[PDB]
Design a protein around this ligand. Structure first.
Ligand SMILES: Nc1ncnc2c1ncn2[C@@H]1O[C@H](COP(=O)(O)OP(=O)(O)OC[C@H]2O[C@@H](O)[C@H](O)[C@@H]2O)[C@@H](O)[C@H]1O
Length: 162
């Protein structure tokens, strides 16, 4: 009720705000990180998640990548929450700058469905250069669990809420 939000369907609510703040409000949730294949948390939400954890997220991510090797595009990994959420689901969206197809967002978003409550940004819609409407369409087509899709730009919010 405190946020500009639009309930889209029985699964998805679009929220204008900061995904970290929304994840903190909910008593139980998974927070989704928009990651790269090496979980090297850069200039988008990944860096903000890492900084909010005091670097704990990057330390854990490095440990995982040593155990797994690099992820494939479209893969995800459930790691610890570090007080931000019950857990963080790191998803590797396609990077359009590297000619990776937006269709791989199907794999990213399907990974949400085993989790009861998900708080997510729009995967690939920032640095990875996929149209926010395209990412949101893949989200709506594939997500079948209670999901708060949090966007921090009001113009994007207005576009997607219409
Ligand atoms: N705190 C936030 N809350 C909600 N949405 C946010 C927030 N910060 C950024 N966003 C939005 O989330 C969307 C995803 O943007 P990025 O975080 O840039 O994600 P992506 O486009 O998937 O790029 C992934 C790449 O960026 C690096 O951070 C990461 O390490 C990877 O290399 C964009 O629309 C961006 O504006």
């Amino acid at each position: 009720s405190k946020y500009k939000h639009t309930v889209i369907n029985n699964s998805v609510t679009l929220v204008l705000g900061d995904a970290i703040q929304i994840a903190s409000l909910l008593p139980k949730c998974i927070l989704v990180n928009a990651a790269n294949r090496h979980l090297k948390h850069g200039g988008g939400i990944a860096g903000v998640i890492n900084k909010a954890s005091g670097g704990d997220v990057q330390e854990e991510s490095d440990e995982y990548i040593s155990n797994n090797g690099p992820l494939h595009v479209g893969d995800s990994v459930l790691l610890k929450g570090h007080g931000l959420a019950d857990a963080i689901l790191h998803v590797v969206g396609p990077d359009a700058r590297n000619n990776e197809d937006a269709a791989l967002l199907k794999r990213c978003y399907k990974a949400f469905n085993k989790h009861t409550i998900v708080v997510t940004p729009l995967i690939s819609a920032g640095i990875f250069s996929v149209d926010p409407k395209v990412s949101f369409e893949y989200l709506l087509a594939n997500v079948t669990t209670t999901t708060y899709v949090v966007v921090n730009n009001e113009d994007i919010y207005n576009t997607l809420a219409t």
